């Protein structure tokens, strides 16, 4: 399949080179996979989700995404137009309030929730969790992310937007998950992207168009936007049978575009998520 005039990030993860405009992908499109978006929620009614999104848990008064961020991230995972894995199932877990903030105890609970809830879902191609969030280092946050990964979920987390070493942020600094830095359309590390040895992969993160609340769309930037590209790619590769939840991060790093990015500090991987699709 080929989506013409795709968002740059989708084009980029199906190209060896920057500057293309078509997103090339196997039509399986993540069918049979599931991705939990652990964030401010998902506006499941957005037409772009085609009925494939649902809220499954909230830690606040409502399950509504009153912010947008979670809807955006979900759209990069699996919306029709803006998503990597256009046929995946999306599950929303609202751990962040409508200002985009959340307490670590709540975030931890949301991870534990996914680890359990997945056992109640029919996700034959496997389960991914996308965590476009983080704060300062916390061993308990990292441990929760590690547990979620261990439970059989491919966990992708944002590196953080501090232009600093991700070792000081969580869950970015948890080694066992897939920690995702952000790039821009010119293959530069995004100006705000964290870096460091703990990064596994980069994905598109600057000026990413996706769904927004109110049935809208908008472009925003962040490692929060890079993370769902990776989560969606994992879902897509799992549906293809190329990898598993346990191995997807490594597979993605293995099969990434290597050495394409600029302003990568020495000791940070130079790896950009790539689907390797061949028609
Ligand atoms: Ca290249
Ligand atoms: Ca890792």
PDB file of C-alpha atoms and ligand atoms in Angstrom:
ATOM      1  CA  UNK A   1       0.000   0.000   0.000  1.00  0.00           C
ATOM      2  CA  UNK A   2       0.980   3.579  -0.556  1.00  0.00           C
ATOM      3  CA  UNK A   3      -0.449   6.667   1.065  1.00  0.00           C
ATOM      4  CA  UNK A   4       0.332   9.675  -1.059  1.00  0.00           C
ATOM      5  CA  UNK A   5       1.072  13.061   0.497  1.00  0.00           C
ATOM      6  CA  UNK A   6       1.480  11.441   3.866  1.00  0.00           C
ATOM      7  CA  UNK A   7       2.709  13.326   6.925  1.00  0.00           C
ATOM      8  CA  UNK A   8       6.443  13.599   6.590  1.00  0.00           C
ATOM      9  CA  UNK A   9       7.073  11.252   9.510  1.00  0.00           C
ATOM     10  CA  UNK A  10       5.132   8.383   7.925  1.00  0.00           C
ATOM     11  CA  UNK A  11       6.957   8.903   4.665  1.00  0.00           C
ATOM     12  CA  UNK A  12      10.204   8.950   6.542  1.00  0.00           C
ATOM     13  CA  UNK A  13       9.719   5.644   8.274  1.00  0.00           C
ATOM     14  CA  UNK A  14       9.137   3.969   4.856  1.00  0.00           C
ATOM     15  CA  UNK A  15      12.150   5.526   3.134  1.00  0.00           C
ATOM     16  CA  UNK A  16      15.891   5.188   3.379  1.00  0.00           C
ATOM     17  CA  UNK A  17      16.094   8.913   2.665  1.00  0.00           C
ATOM     18  CA  UNK A  18      14.485  12.125   3.909  1.00  0.00           C
ATOM     19  CA  UNK A  19      12.289  14.315   1.862  1.00  0.00           C
ATOM     20  CA  UNK A  20       9.813  11.797   0.415  1.00  0.00           C
ATOM     21  CA  UNK A  21       6.063  12.216   0.627  1.00  0.00           C
ATOM     22  CA  UNK A  22       4.539   8.704   0.189  1.00  0.00           C
ATOM     23  CA  UNK A  23       4.131   6.306   3.087  1.00  0.00           C
ATOM     24  CA  UNK A  24       4.728   2.784   1.754  1.00  0.00           C
ATOM     25  CA  UNK A  25       3.411   0.007   3.997  1.00  0.00           C
ATOM     26  CA  UNK A  26       2.118  -3.535   3.888  1.00  0.00           C
ATOM     27  CA  UNK A  27      -1.660  -3.517   3.755  1.00  0.00           C
ATOM     28  CA  UNK A  28      -1.874  -5.721   6.846  1.00  0.00           C
ATOM     29  CA  UNK A  29      -1.286  -2.373   8.620  1.00  0.00           C
ATOM     30  CA  UNK A  30      -1.051  -3.722  12.153  1.00  0.00           C
ATOM     31  CA  UNK A  31      -4.321  -5.619  11.932  1.00  0.00           C
ATOM     32  CA  UNK A  32      -4.693  -7.982  14.869  1.00  0.00           C
ATOM     33  CA  UNK A  33      -2.250  -5.986  17.033  1.00  0.00           C
ATOM     34  CA  UNK A  34      -3.221  -3.725  19.920  1.00  0.00           C
ATOM     35  CA  UNK A  35      -1.640  -0.528  21.129  1.00  0.00           C
ATOM     36  CA  UNK A  36      -2.330   1.029  24.507  1.00  0.00           C
ATOM     37  CA  UNK A  37      -1.801   4.792  24.486  1.00  0.00           C
ATOM     38  CA  UNK A  38      -1.096   5.799  28.052  1.00  0.00           C
ATOM     39  CA  UNK A  39      -1.679   9.522  28.052  1.00  0.00           C
ATOM     40  CA  UNK A  40      -4.400  12.148  28.426  1.00  0.00           C
ATOM     41  CA  UNK A  41      -6.927   9.798  26.789  1.00  0.00           C
ATOM     42  CA  UNK A  42      -8.095   9.279  23.237  1.00  0.00           C
ATOM     43  CA  UNK A  43     -11.022  10.971  21.515  1.00  0.00           C
ATOM     44  CA  UNK A  44     -12.226   7.606  20.248  1.00  0.00           C
ATOM     45  CA  UNK A  45     -15.071   9.180  18.314  1.00  0.00           C
ATOM     46  CA  UNK A  46     -12.646  10.945  16.008  1.00  0.00           C
ATOM     47  CA  UNK A  47     -13.478   9.725  12.474  1.00  0.00           C
ATOM     48  CA  UNK A  48      -9.812   9.066  11.870  1.00  0.00           C
ATOM     49  CA  UNK A  49      -9.935   6.140  14.265  1.00  0.00           C
ATOM     50  CA  UNK A  50     -12.665   4.381  12.292  1.00  0.00           C
ATOM     51  CA  UNK A  51     -14.067   2.757  15.392  1.00  0.00           C
ATOM     52  CA  UNK A  52     -10.734   1.119  16.226  1.00  0.00           C
ATOM     53  CA  UNK A  53     -10.097   3.229  19.318  1.00  0.00           C
ATOM     54  CA  UNK A  54     -11.642   2.867  22.740  1.00  0.00           C
ATOM     55  CA  UNK A  55     -10.947   4.167  26.195  1.00  0.00           C
ATOM     56  CA  UNK A  56     -10.340   1.345  28.588  1.00  0.00           C
ATOM     57  CA  UNK A  57      -9.274   3.150  31.787  1.00  0.00           C
ATOM     58  CA  UNK A  58      -9.158   6.604  33.319  1.00  0.00           C
ATOM     59  CA  UNK A  59      -7.622   7.858  36.531  1.00  0.00           C
ATOM     60  CA  UNK A  60      -9.607  11.051  36.468  1.00  0.00           C
ATOM     61  CA  UNK A  61     -13.181  12.143  36.633  1.00  0.00           C
ATOM     62  CA  UNK A  62     -13.768  11.481  32.949  1.00  0.00           C
ATOM     63  CA  UNK A  63     -12.232   9.314  30.290  1.00  0.00           C
ATOM     64  CA  UNK A  64     -12.454  12.261  27.885  1.00  0.00           C
ATOM     65  CA  UNK A  65      -9.274  13.625  26.438  1.00  0.00           C
ATOM     66  CA  UNK A  66      -9.677  17.227  27.450  1.00  0.00           C
ATOM     67  CA  UNK A  67      -6.168  18.073  26.341  1.00  0.00           C
ATOM     68  CA  UNK A  68      -5.478  16.598  22.882  1.00  0.00           C
ATOM     69  CA  UNK A  69      -2.066  15.183  23.490  1.00  0.00           C
ATOM     70  CA  UNK A  70      -3.225  11.617  23.873  1.00  0.00           C
ATOM     71  CA  UNK A  71      -5.461  11.847  20.847  1.00  0.00           C
ATOM     72  CA  UNK A  72      -2.522  13.151  18.851  1.00  0.00           C
ATOM     73  CA  UNK A  73      -0.270  10.335  19.936  1.00  0.00           C
ATOM     74  CA  UNK A  74      -2.971   7.749  19.273  1.00  0.00           C
ATOM     75  CA  UNK A  75      -3.440   9.191  15.821  1.00  0.00           C
ATOM     76  CA  UNK A  76       0.249   8.716  15.053  1.00  0.00           C
ATOM     77  CA  UNK A  77       0.021   5.113  16.168  1.00  0.00           C
ATOM     78  CA  UNK A  78      -3.109   4.137  14.299  1.00  0.00           C
ATOM     79  CA  UNK A  79      -5.307   6.753  12.716  1.00  0.00           C
ATOM     80  CA  UNK A  80      -6.229   6.235   9.084  1.00  0.00           C
ATOM     81  CA  UNK A  81      -4.450   9.287   7.722  1.00  0.00           C
ATOM     82  CA  UNK A  82      -1.861   9.990  10.369  1.00  0.00           C
ATOM     83  CA  UNK A  83      -1.041   6.565  11.696  1.00  0.00           C
ATOM     84  CA  UNK A  84       1.739   4.101  11.144  1.00  0.00           C
ATOM     85  CA  UNK A  85      -0.373   1.050  11.838  1.00  0.00           C
ATOM     86  CA  UNK A  86      -3.663   2.016  10.227  1.00  0.00           C
ATOM     87  CA  UNK A  87      -5.541  -1.173  11.157  1.00  0.00           C
ATOM     88  CA  UNK A  88      -4.389  -1.641  14.748  1.00  0.00           C
ATOM     89  CA  UNK A  89      -6.672  -1.552  17.740  1.00  0.00           C
ATOM     90  CA  UNK A  90      -6.125   1.446  20.021  1.00  0.00           C
ATOM     91  CA  UNK A  91      -6.801   1.386  23.757  1.00  0.00           C
ATOM     92  CA  UNK A  92      -6.697   4.600  25.740  1.00  0.00           C
ATOM     93  CA  UNK A  93      -5.484   4.763  29.329  1.00  0.00           C
ATOM     94  CA  UNK A  94      -5.868   8.233  30.789  1.00  0.00           C
ATOM     95  CA  UNK A  95      -3.090   8.741  33.334  1.00  0.00           C
ATOM     96  CA  UNK A  96      -2.581  12.416  32.528  1.00  0.00           C
ATOM     97  CA  UNK A  97      -5.017  15.143  33.393  1.00  0.00           C
ATOM     98  CA  UNK A  98      -6.412  17.638  30.920  1.00  0.00           C
ATOM     99  CA  UNK A  99      -3.438  19.908  31.457  1.00  0.00           C
ATOM    100  CA  UNK A 100      -1.179  17.071  30.348  1.00  0.00           C
ATOM    101  CA  UNK A 101       0.167  16.439  33.847  1.00  0.00           C
ATOM    102  CA  UNK A 102       0.070  13.350  35.992  1.00  0.00           C
ATOM    103  CA  UNK A 103       1.455  12.051  39.204  1.00  0.00           C
ATOM    104  CA  UNK A 104       3.917   9.239  39.009  1.00  0.00           C
ATOM    105  CA  UNK A 105       1.781   7.010  41.194  1.00  0.00           C
ATOM    106  CA  UNK A 106      -1.048   7.330  38.654  1.00  0.00           C
ATOM    107  CA  UNK A 107       1.272   6.700  35.696  1.00  0.00           C
ATOM    108  CA  UNK A 108       2.606   3.613  37.410  1.00  0.00           C
ATOM    109  CA  UNK A 109      -0.900   2.399  38.044  1.00  0.00           C
ATOM    110  CA  UNK A 110      -1.776   2.872  34.393  1.00  0.00           C
ATOM    111  CA  UNK A 111       1.190   0.731  33.329  1.00  0.00           C
ATOM    112  CA  UNK A 112       0.213  -2.004  35.739  1.00  0.00           C
ATOM    113  CA  UNK A 113      -3.275  -1.750  34.386  1.00  0.00           C
ATOM    114  CA  UNK A 114      -2.189  -2.435  30.847  1.00  0.00           C
ATOM    115  CA  UNK A 115      -0.074  -5.397  31.880  1.00  0.00           C
ATOM    116  CA  UNK A 116      -3.211  -6.976  33.272  1.00  0.00           C
ATOM    117  CA  UNK A 117      -5.853  -5.713  30.933  1.00  0.00           C
ATOM    118  CA  UNK A 118      -4.152  -7.103  27.867  1.00  0.00           C
ATOM    119  CA  UNK A 119      -4.985 -10.584  29.129  1.00  0.00           C
ATOM    120  CA  UNK A 120      -8.651  -9.661  28.578  1.00  0.00           C
ATOM    121  CA  UNK A 121      -8.224  -8.527  24.951  1.00  0.00           C
ATOM    122  CA  UNK A 122      -7.971 -10.456  21.730  1.00  0.00           C
ATOM    123  CA  UNK A 123      -4.679  -9.160  20.283  1.00  0.00           C
ATOM    124  CA  UNK A 124      -3.456 -12.122  18.223  1.00  0.00           C
ATOM    125  CA  UNK A 125      -0.487 -10.279  16.756  1.00  0.00           C
ATOM    126  CA  UNK A 126       0.591  -8.862  20.122  1.00  0.00           C
ATOM    127  CA  UNK A 127       0.422  -5.832  22.320  1.00  0.00           C
ATOM    128  CA  UNK A 128       2.277  -2.503  22.368  1.00  0.00           C
ATOM    129  CA  UNK A 129       2.150   0.382  24.821  1.00  0.00           C
ATOM    130  CA  UNK A 130       3.055   3.918  23.901  1.00  0.00           C
ATOM    131  CA  UNK A 131       4.122   6.233  26.738  1.00  0.00           C
ATOM    132  CA  UNK A 132       4.551   9.812  25.548  1.00  0.00           C
ATOM    133  CA  UNK A 133       5.250  11.111  29.009  1.00  0.00           C
ATOM    134  CA  UNK A 134       7.868  11.426  31.636  1.00  0.00           C
ATOM    135  CA  UNK A 135       9.487  13.486  34.303  1.00  0.00           C
ATOM    136  CA  UNK A 136      12.546  13.317  36.498  1.00  0.00           C
ATOM    137  CA  UNK A 137      14.258  10.073  37.316  1.00  0.00           C
ATOM    138  CA  UNK A 138      12.191   7.682  39.357  1.00  0.00           C
ATOM    139  CA  UNK A 139      13.186   4.105  39.974  1.00  0.00           C
ATOM    140  CA  UNK A 140       9.569   3.237  40.670  1.00  0.00           C
ATOM    141  CA  UNK A 141       8.410   4.673  37.342  1.00  0.00           C
ATOM    142  CA  UNK A 142      11.202   2.809  35.607  1.00  0.00           C
ATOM    143  CA  UNK A 143      10.320  -0.378  37.410  1.00  0.00           C
ATOM    144  CA  UNK A 144       6.693  -0.067  36.283  1.00  0.00           C
ATOM    145  CA  UNK A 145       7.783   0.321  32.697  1.00  0.00           C
ATOM    146  CA  UNK A 146      10.053  -2.665  33.073  1.00  0.00           C
ATOM    147  CA  UNK A 147       7.194  -4.729  34.461  1.00  0.00           C
ATOM    148  CA  UNK A 148       4.940  -3.759  31.594  1.00  0.00           C
ATOM    149  CA  UNK A 149       7.598  -4.849  29.097  1.00  0.00           C
ATOM    150  CA  UNK A 150       8.257  -8.074  30.998  1.00  0.00           C
ATOM    151  CA  UNK A 151       4.537  -8.881  30.930  1.00  0.00           C
ATOM    152  CA  UNK A 152       4.743  -9.221  27.149  1.00  0.00           C
ATOM    153  CA  UNK A 153       3.993  -5.688  25.935  1.00  0.00           C
ATOM    154  CA  UNK A 154       6.280  -3.821  23.611  1.00  0.00           C
ATOM    155  CA  UNK A 155       6.827  -0.640  25.577  1.00  0.00           C
ATOM    156  CA  UNK A 156       7.893   2.525  23.746  1.00  0.00           C
ATOM    157  CA  UNK A 157       8.567   5.614  25.794  1.00  0.00           C
ATOM    158  CA  UNK A 158       9.554   9.170  25.048  1.00  0.00           C
ATOM    159  CA  UNK A 159      13.118  10.170  25.641  1.00  0.00           C
ATOM    160  CA  UNK A 160      12.033  13.600  26.892  1.00  0.00           C
ATOM    161  CA  UNK A 161      12.222  17.149  25.596  1.00  0.00           C
ATOM    162  CA  UNK A 162      14.979  18.554  27.791  1.00  0.00           C
ATOM    163  CA  UNK A 163      17.855  18.529  25.305  1.00  0.00           C
ATOM    164  CA  UNK A 164      19.675  16.544  27.914  1.00  0.00           C
ATOM    165  CA  UNK A 165      20.754  13.064  28.759  1.00  0.00           C
ATOM    166  CA  UNK A 166      17.700  10.846  29.136  1.00  0.00           C
ATOM    167  CA  UNK A 167      19.435   9.046  32.010  1.00  0.00           C
ATOM    168  CA  UNK A 168      17.877  11.693  34.275  1.00  0.00           C
ATOM    169  CA  UNK A 169      14.296  11.151  33.172  1.00  0.00           C
ATOM    170  CA  UNK A 170      11.762   8.426  33.604  1.00  0.00           C
ATOM    171  CA  UNK A 171      10.535   6.183  32.158  1.00  0.00           C
ATOM    172  CA  UNK A 172      13.037   7.161  29.460  1.00  0.00           C
ATOM    173  CA  UNK A 173      15.922   5.895  31.521  1.00  0.00           C
ATOM    174  CA  UNK A 174      14.489   2.392  31.997  1.00  0.00           C
ATOM    175  CA  UNK A 175      16.824   0.215  29.923  1.00  0.00           C
ATOM    176  CA  UNK A 176      14.439  -2.610  29.091  1.00  0.00           C
ATOM    177  CA  UNK A 177      11.873  -0.542  27.220  1.00  0.00           C
ATOM    178  CA  UNK A 178      12.236   1.213  23.881  1.00  0.00           C
ATOM    179  CA  UNK A 179      13.302   4.791  24.536  1.00  0.00           C
ATOM    180  CA  UNK A 180      12.563   7.029  21.590  1.00  0.00           C
ATOM    181  CA  UNK A 181      14.266  10.278  20.614  1.00  0.00           C
ATOM    182  CA  UNK A 182      12.894  12.741  18.125  1.00  0.00           C
ATOM    183  CA  UNK A 183      14.102  13.803  14.700  1.00  0.00           C
ATOM    184  CA  UNK A 184      13.016  16.467  12.289  1.00  0.00           C
ATOM    185  CA  UNK A 185      12.206  16.324   8.610  1.00  0.00           C
ATOM    186  CA  UNK A 186      15.775  17.194   7.698  1.00  0.00           C
ATOM    187  CA  UNK A 187      17.131  14.238   9.691  1.00  0.00           C
ATOM    188  CA  UNK A 188      18.418  16.422  12.497  1.00  0.00           C
ATOM    189  CA  UNK A 189      17.926  15.372  16.052  1.00  0.00           C
ATOM    190  CA  UNK A 190      15.043  17.573  17.159  1.00  0.00           C
ATOM    191  CA  UNK A 191      16.370  20.574  19.056  1.00  0.00           C
ATOM    192  CA  UNK A 192      14.566  19.584  22.203  1.00  0.00           C
ATOM    193  CA  UNK A 193      15.184  15.844  22.028  1.00  0.00           C
ATOM    194  CA  UNK A 194      16.941  14.155  24.852  1.00  0.00           C
ATOM    195  CA  UNK A 195      19.862  11.951  23.925  1.00  0.00           C
ATOM    196  CA  UNK A 196      22.171   9.522  25.645  1.00  0.00           C
ATOM    197  CA  UNK A 197      23.148   5.907  25.801  1.00  0.00           C
ATOM    198  CA  UNK A 198      19.708   4.808  26.905  1.00  0.00           C
ATOM    199  CA  UNK A 199      18.034   5.854  23.654  1.00  0.00           C
ATOM    200  CA  UNK A 200      17.171   2.875  21.476  1.00  0.00           C
ATOM    201  CA  UNK A 201      15.862   4.600  18.414  1.00  0.00           C
ATOM    202  CA  UNK A 202      14.754   7.873  16.936  1.00  0.00           C
ATOM    203  CA  UNK A 203      11.492   8.587  15.239  1.00  0.00           C
ATOM    204  CA  UNK A 204       9.923  11.632  13.617  1.00  0.00           C
ATOM    205  CA  UNK A 205       9.088  14.165  16.297  1.00  0.00           C
ATOM    206  CA  UNK A 206       9.211  17.717  14.973  1.00  0.00           C
ATOM    207  CA  UNK A 207       6.076  19.107  13.291  1.00  0.00           C
ATOM    208  CA  UNK A 208       4.010  15.948  13.361  1.00  0.00           C
ATOM    209  CA  UNK A 209       0.489  16.218  12.040  1.00  0.00           C
ATOM    210  CA  UNK A 210      -2.050  14.027  13.745  1.00  0.00           C
ATOM    211  CA  UNK A 211      -5.508  13.923  15.239  1.00  0.00           C
ATOM    212  CA  UNK A 212      -6.642  16.360  17.906  1.00  0.00           C
ATOM    213  CA  UNK A 213      -9.701  16.762  20.103  1.00  0.00           C
ATOM    214  CA  UNK A 214     -12.824  18.223  18.704  1.00  0.00           C
ATOM    215  CA  UNK A 215     -12.439  15.973  15.651  1.00  0.00           C
ATOM    216  CA  UNK A 216      -9.589  18.195  14.518  1.00  0.00           C
ATOM    217  CA  UNK A 217      -5.976  17.855  13.560  1.00  0.00           C
ATOM    218  CA  UNK A 218      -2.845  19.743  14.401  1.00  0.00           C
ATOM    219  CA  UNK A 219       0.909  19.598  14.192  1.00  0.00           C
ATOM    220  CA  UNK A 220       2.939  19.528  17.339  1.00  0.00           C
ATOM    221  CA  UNK A 221       6.450  18.542  18.253  1.00  0.00           C
ATOM    222  CA  UNK A 222       8.038  16.367  20.877  1.00  0.00           C
ATOM    223  CA  UNK A 223       9.556  13.084  21.763  1.00  0.00           C
ATOM    224  CA  UNK A 224       5.916  12.429  22.560  1.00  0.00           C
ATOM    225  CA  UNK A 225       5.284  12.423  18.815  1.00  0.00           C
ATOM    226  CA  UNK A 226       8.280  10.225  17.989  1.00  0.00           C
ATOM    227  CA  UNK A 227       7.259   7.550  20.469  1.00  0.00           C
ATOM    228  CA  UNK A 228       3.952   6.606  18.754  1.00  0.00           C
ATOM    229  CA  UNK A 229       5.719   6.290  15.418  1.00  0.00           C
ATOM    230  CA  UNK A 230       7.812   3.564  17.021  1.00  0.00           C
ATOM    231  CA  UNK A 231       4.901   2.026  18.849  1.00  0.00           C
ATOM    232  CA  UNK A 232       2.912   1.911  15.617  1.00  0.00           C
ATOM    233  CA  UNK A 233       5.871   0.488  13.728  1.00  0.00           C
ATOM    234  CA  UNK A 234       6.244  -2.248  16.328  1.00  0.00           C
ATOM    235  CA  UNK A 235       2.568  -3.102  15.950  1.00  0.00           C
ATOM    236  CA  UNK A 236       2.965  -3.219  12.187  1.00  0.00           C
ATOM    237  CA  UNK A 237       6.011  -5.472  12.337  1.00  0.00           C
ATOM    238  CA  UNK A 238       4.361  -7.762  14.876  1.00  0.00           C
ATOM    239  CA  UNK A 239       1.379  -8.164  12.586  1.00  0.00           C
ATOM    240  CA  UNK A 240       3.784  -9.131   9.796  1.00  0.00           C
ATOM    241  CA  UNK A 241       5.278 -11.748  12.045  1.00  0.00           C
ATOM    242  CA  UNK A 242       8.728 -10.188  11.782  1.00  0.00           C
ATOM    243  CA  UNK A 243       9.194  -9.676  15.474  1.00  0.00           C
ATOM    244  CA  UNK A 244       7.608 -10.072  18.862  1.00  0.00           C
ATOM    245  CA  UNK A 245       6.837  -7.745  21.739  1.00  0.00           C
ATOM    246  CA  UNK A 246       9.984  -8.850  23.546  1.00  0.00           C
ATOM    247  CA  UNK A 247      12.208  -8.354  20.541  1.00  0.00           C
ATOM    248  CA  UNK A 248      10.597  -5.517  18.590  1.00  0.00           C
ATOM    249  CA  UNK A 249      12.743  -2.691  19.902  1.00  0.00           C
ATOM    250  CA  UNK A 250      15.882  -4.578  19.003  1.00  0.00           C
ATOM    251  CA  UNK A 251      14.427  -5.543  15.650  1.00  0.00           C
ATOM    252  CA  UNK A 252      13.563  -1.932  14.920  1.00  0.00           C
ATOM    253  CA  UNK A 253      17.043  -0.823  15.913  1.00  0.00           C
ATOM    254  CA  UNK A 254      18.518  -3.687  13.815  1.00  0.00           C
ATOM    255  CA  UNK A 255      16.510  -2.669  10.740  1.00  0.00           C
ATOM    256  CA  UNK A 256      16.657   1.081  11.250  1.00  0.00           C
ATOM    257  CA  UNK A 257      18.198   3.626   8.942  1.00  0.00           C
ATOM    258  CA  UNK A 258      21.666   3.926  10.373  1.00  0.00           C
ATOM    259  CA  UNK A 259      23.789   7.062  10.400  1.00  0.00           C
ATOM    260  CA  UNK A 260      21.157   9.285   8.724  1.00  0.00           C
ATOM    261  CA  UNK A 261      20.713  11.761  11.607  1.00  0.00           C
ATOM    262  CA  UNK A 262      22.724  14.844  12.406  1.00  0.00           C
ATOM    263  CA  UNK A 263      23.497  16.512  15.784  1.00  0.00           C
ATOM    264  CA  UNK A 264      23.639  13.112  17.433  1.00  0.00           C
ATOM    265  CA  UNK A 265      26.016  13.354  20.373  1.00  0.00           C
ATOM    266  CA  UNK A 266      28.711  10.720  20.425  1.00  0.00           C
ATOM    267  CA  UNK A 267      27.396   7.737  22.435  1.00  0.00           C
ATOM    268  CA  UNK A 268      23.829   8.175  21.282  1.00  0.00           C
ATOM    269  CA  UNK A 269      22.513   5.770  18.693  1.00  0.00           C
ATOM    270  CA  UNK A 270      22.176   7.081  15.168  1.00  0.00           C
ATOM    271  CA  UNK A 271      19.173   4.969  14.271  1.00  0.00           C
ATOM    272  CA  UNK A 272      15.908   6.099  12.694  1.00  0.00           C
ATOM    273  CA  UNK A 273      12.891   3.848  12.660  1.00  0.00           C
ATOM    274  CA  UNK A 274      12.317   2.302   9.226  1.00  0.00           C
ATOM    275  CA  UNK A 275       9.779  -0.277   8.049  1.00  0.00           C
ATOM    276  CA  UNK A 276      11.936  -1.797   5.298  1.00  0.00           C
ATOM    277  CA  UNK A 277       8.879  -2.222   3.164  1.00  0.00           C
ATOM    278  CA  UNK A 278       9.459  -3.705  -0.283  1.00  0.00           C
ATOM    279  CA  UNK A 279       6.413  -3.948  -2.579  1.00  0.00           C
TER     280      UNK A 279
HETATM  281 CA1  LIG B   1      19.677   7.011   4.423  1.00  0.00          CA
HETATM  282 CA1  LIG B   2      16.115   0.156  25.790  1.00  0.00          CA
END
